[PDB]
């Protein structure tokens, strides 16, 4: 038992990262096969990033202007192209750790997990959740850019988030690996702003399901509801609304733990309407909503990947 | 900015798990050169787990019992002790993926990243902390035994934790490489209680001042305070008492934030005197003590390992 904000092993990824530098930018790259994917304003300048043209800047560059190292040794750029916010630097070399994997792009609600890097070399690893405002919620410093976020799923790592950029209130924006934004923003500088952001519910009672699971019944209280019903006091404290299919998706627990789904709704619109009182579940004073189901899932039955 | 729970790189970590089997007991190892070690109860039956006699179980094991696998790959067996709770099998093929590696006995209130592994394959990484009643507070589930707690230093990766147990309120239990447990345990099925908890006070400390250099400044107030002084208070709310060289560690956050330690523990005296008041520090509602003085360090600096 127990339960913590768990990240997927970030072995496979690790062996993918590089440093890219052009100039006197240097951010991160990602190196899968004989191609190297990293954000397009390493071609920037501390100026350009204020108004870029990065099709004028880009077309001002050549293959040998791009410095690609994997650890100390240099991978040679025979090519290059942009696709929307991501440069494709196509080197002489293939990376022999590549794993198998797919470029997937995640919607609001799906969780992650991000290995942060600076100078090609990783950080640290930590989890993350796309919030309802196309924004996340992470740890990036300067250097940082060009970092990935990715799911394994057995062996096949779905890379799902690039990092380009950091908003108002310490958030975190950046795109696909085919370089196309999370939410409305643009990758310059200049003052932009996500958002109202809105709690995830399904993932607040997959969370409520894994404290069950855990012992944590407290809050459990003997009444039911309408999903109608339900949805009208969600609305309020700004919860995301419930749907049919979130409610087949948490199918799964609710089978676990002989709950169902609307009377599991009705103690979370309880925990609402009267707060929690002082008390904790699974050790947190606030609910939490950067758990999937599928999340609570895998931990609570201990699937691996290797 | 921003600031997550973030647990170390996991990658040299994962190229050294293995799955060790006795009869019908699987656990994970850890493979280090041409040596696996593993919690010595794998040569347990579920009826041994009562009162074992471990060496006694051993005496009737000879090389050729314990099937070690590194993924489907079996490594064959040529040599077997043990020291203290963990078992040493010499393998005759050296591990070629070892990492620069130590085996250190951490102290309470130092943290430390889990790799949560099954039957030799990682699940995931979370960050954790040794606590003053020498438990931690994992994820473990049946046959998570040998899963290992590390940290890492550039390229060194210090093991501190390999774990062996639960205990009544779903914490944790384990010991160092060497086989030595930490605190009062045994591995033996019988009720065994971890004494009272208490707060690691330089943690919260040190996370107070990652809310400052974040921007949450709210809680600091215009005073100071004693050593002596704070330590009274402290005590009243179950608090470690601070030392000297705990002041003398938290010295590089102050010198940054230009807040003395001692000022910054009248703040600290104040929220524990008269609570937070439905508002959050680093988007917590309670006071973190999971993060040291040097995690705090490397996360807002962006230390790197490779
Ligand atoms: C890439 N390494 C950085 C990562 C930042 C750096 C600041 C701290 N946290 C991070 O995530 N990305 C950039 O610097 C990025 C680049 C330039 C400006 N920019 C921003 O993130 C800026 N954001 C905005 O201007 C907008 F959000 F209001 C700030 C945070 C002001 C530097 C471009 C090319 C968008
Ligand atoms: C090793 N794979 C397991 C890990 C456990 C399993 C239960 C769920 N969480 C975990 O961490 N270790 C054991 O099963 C361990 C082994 C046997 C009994 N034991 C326990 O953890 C037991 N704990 C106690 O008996 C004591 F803490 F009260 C429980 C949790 C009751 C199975 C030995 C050899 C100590």
Same mark, same amino acid.
Request: net charge negative; hydrophobic share 35%; aromatic share 10%.
């Given at each position: 038992?127990?339960?913590?904000?768990?990240?997927?092993?970030?072995?496979?990824? @690790?062996?993918?990262?590089?440093?890219?530098?052009?100039?006197?930018?240097?951010?991160?790259?990602?190196?899968?096969?004989?191609?190297?994917?990293?954000?397009?304003?390493?071609?920037?300048?501390? @100026? /350009?990033?204020?108004?870029?043209?990065? @099709?004028?800047?880009?077309?001002?560059?050549?293959?040998?202007?791009?410095?690609?190292?994997?650890?100390?040794?240099?991978?040679?750029?025979?090519?290059?192209?942009?696709?929307?916010?991501?440069?494709?630097?196509?080197?002489?070399?293939?990376?022999?750790?590549?794993?198998?994997?797919?470029?997937?792009?995640?919607?609001?609600?799906?969780?992650?997990?991000?290995?942060?890097?600076?100078?090609? !070399?990783?950080?640290?690893?930590?989890?993350? +959740?796309?919030?309802?405002?196309?924004?996340?919620?992470?740890?990036?410093?300067?250097?940082?850019?060009? !970092?990935?976020?990715?799911?394994?799923?057995?062996?096949?790592?779905?890379?799902?988030?690039?990092?380009?950029? @950091?908003?108002?209130?310490?958030?975190? +924006?950046?795109?696909?690996?085919?370089?196309?934004?999370?939410?409305?923003?643009? /990758?310059?500088?200049?003052?932009?702003?996500?958002?109202?952001?809105?709690?995830?519910?399904? $993932?607040?009672?997959?969370?409520?399901?894994?404290?069950?699971?855990?012992?944590?019944?407290?809050?459990? $209280?003997?009444?039911?509801?309408?999903?109608?019903?339900?949805?009208?006091?969600?609305?309020?404290?700004?919860?995301?609304?419930?749907?049919?299919?979130?409610?087949?998706?948490?199918?799964?627990? !609710?089978?676990?733990?002989?709950? +169902?789904?609307?009377?599991?709704? +009705?103690?979370?619109?309880?925990?609402?309407?009267?707060?929690?009182?002082?008390?904790?579940?699974?050790?947190?004073?606030?609910?939490?909503?950067?758990?999937?189901?599928?999340?609570?899932?895998?931990?609570?039955?201990?699937?691996?990947?290797?």
């Amino acid at each position: 038992s127990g339960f913590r904000k768990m990240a997927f092993p970030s072995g496979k990824v @690790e062996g993918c990262m590089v440093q890219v530098t052009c100039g006197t930018t240097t951010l991160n790259g990602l190196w899968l096969d004989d191609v190297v994917y990293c954000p397009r304003h390493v071609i920037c300048t501390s @100026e /350009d990033m204020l108004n870029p043209n990065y @099709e004028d800047l880009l077309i001002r560059k050549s293959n040998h202007n791009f410095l690609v190292q994997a650890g100390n040794v240099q991978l040679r750029v025979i090519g290059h192209s942009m696709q929307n916010c991501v440069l494709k630097l196509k080197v002489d070399t293939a990376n022999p750790k590549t794993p198998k994997y797919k470029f997937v792009r995640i919607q609001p609600g799906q969780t992650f997990s991000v290995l942060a890097c600076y100078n090609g !070399s990783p950080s640290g690893v930590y989890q993350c +959740a796309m919030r309802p405002n196309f924004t996340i919620k992470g740890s990036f410093l300067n250097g940082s850019c060009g !970092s990935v976020g990715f799911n394994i799923d057995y062996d096949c790592v779905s890379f799902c988030y690039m990092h380009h950029m @950091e908003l108002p209130t310490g958030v975190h +924006a950046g795109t696909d690996l085919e370089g196309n934004f999370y939410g409305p923003f643009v /990758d310059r500088q200049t003052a932009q702003a996500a958002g109202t952001d809105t709690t995830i519910t399904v $993932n607040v009672l997959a969370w409520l399901y894994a404290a069950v699971i855990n012992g944590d019944r407290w809050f459990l $209280n003997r009444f039911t509801t309408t999903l109608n019903d339900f949805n009208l006091v969600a609305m309020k404290y700004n919860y995301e609304p419930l749907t049919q299919d979130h409610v087949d998706i948490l199918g799964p627990l !609710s089978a676990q733990t002989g709950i +169902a789904v609307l009377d599991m709704c +009705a103690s979370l619109k309880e925990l609402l309407q009267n707060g929690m009182n002082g008390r904790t579940i699974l050790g947190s004073a606030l609910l939490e909503d950067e758990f999937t189901p599928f999340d609570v899932v895998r931990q609570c039955s201990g699937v691996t990947f290797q």
